[PDB]
């Protein structure tokens, strides 16, 4: 169960299709 | 031969010397509230003492026995809507010809699902085997089912995946399924499955179903606990 490498401690809202 | 003009310049990442390299900071990410809430909800349910009626649901079927059950269940998956429509059309053709529905159709054999239906079957003792999903929320919908099956004498097993059971019954989610009756060639397989379920699951969980769950501490608190136990053993 590998997870994403996050080089920042900030979570941003994912950009989605508009 | 290597170019003489290429030289290595090491970067010393000690305190106060160079800018720190970009490391994986996933352990320290400020997560959104829903992620944080679901993680702390799991943690709180681990930390508190769980009464036995809920803590019995931690013990589930193992992978081999679950796959052995699903080998029988996939033969008795219910009709899909397209297959049902085709059956209705073929039976309508026979009725248009004037033949009997008893002549053109036969007794079906399917896995029984739906919570009220399965509970009724258990009370009327028509159920041969009962599989109860692990993760029903709210848990009160299924928390009485093992005790009801023990009262009625029906063999039962708690199995991982309400989504897995819903995939059997062509739904998203099934809280419980029941095998009541199978065809003649699968009766030996059903009896072998019931005996294997008894010996593998029920004999193992008879001791542990009455025990209280929870009480598990976190990683750092646990490490403090072995450190104090080691200090006490040294003293």
């Amino acid at each position: 169960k590998k997870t994403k490498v996050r080089k920042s401690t900030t979570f941003h809202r994912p950009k989605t299709l508009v | 031969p290597k170019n003489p003009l290429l030289e290595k310049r090491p970067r010393n990442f000690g305190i106060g010397q160079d800018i720190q390299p970009k490391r994986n900071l996933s352990r320290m990410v400020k997560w959104p509230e829903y992620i944080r809430l679901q993680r702390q909800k799991k943690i709180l349910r681990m930390r508190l003492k769980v009464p036995p009626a809920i803590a019995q649901f931690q013990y589930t079927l193992d992978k081999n026995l679950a796959a052995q059950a699903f080998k029988l269940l996939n033969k008795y998956r219910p009709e899909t809507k397209q297959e049902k429509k085709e059956r209705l059309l073929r039976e309508a053709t026979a009725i248009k010809e004037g033949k009997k529905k008893e002549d053109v159709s036969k007794k079906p054999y399917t896995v029984k699902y739906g919570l009220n239906h399965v509970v009724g079957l258990i009370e009327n003792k028509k159920a041969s085997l009962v599989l109860i999903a692990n993760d029903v929320d709210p848990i009160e919908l299924v928390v009485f089912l093992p005790a009801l099956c023990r009262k009625m004498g029906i063999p039962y097993a708690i199995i991982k995946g309400k989504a897995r059971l819903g995939t059997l019954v062509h739904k998203k989610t099934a809280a419980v399924v029941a095998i009541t009756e199978v065809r003649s060639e699968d009766k030996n397989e059903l009896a072998k499955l019931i005996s294997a379920v008894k010996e593998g699951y029920l004999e193992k969980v008879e001791d542990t179903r009455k025990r209280w769950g929870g009480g598990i501490m976190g990683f750092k608190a646990q490490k403090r606990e072995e450190k104090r136990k080691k200090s006490l053993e040294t003293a």
Partner: protein, 35 residues
Amino acid sequence: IPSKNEAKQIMKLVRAIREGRILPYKPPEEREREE
């Protein structure tokens, strides 16, 4: 005993086929031949 609701759905399908609204049953071989 056969199902009464199934019998009612059969009668509705027979009425539709007699009216010609619903095309009758075709075997998979006939479907492959049409395709």
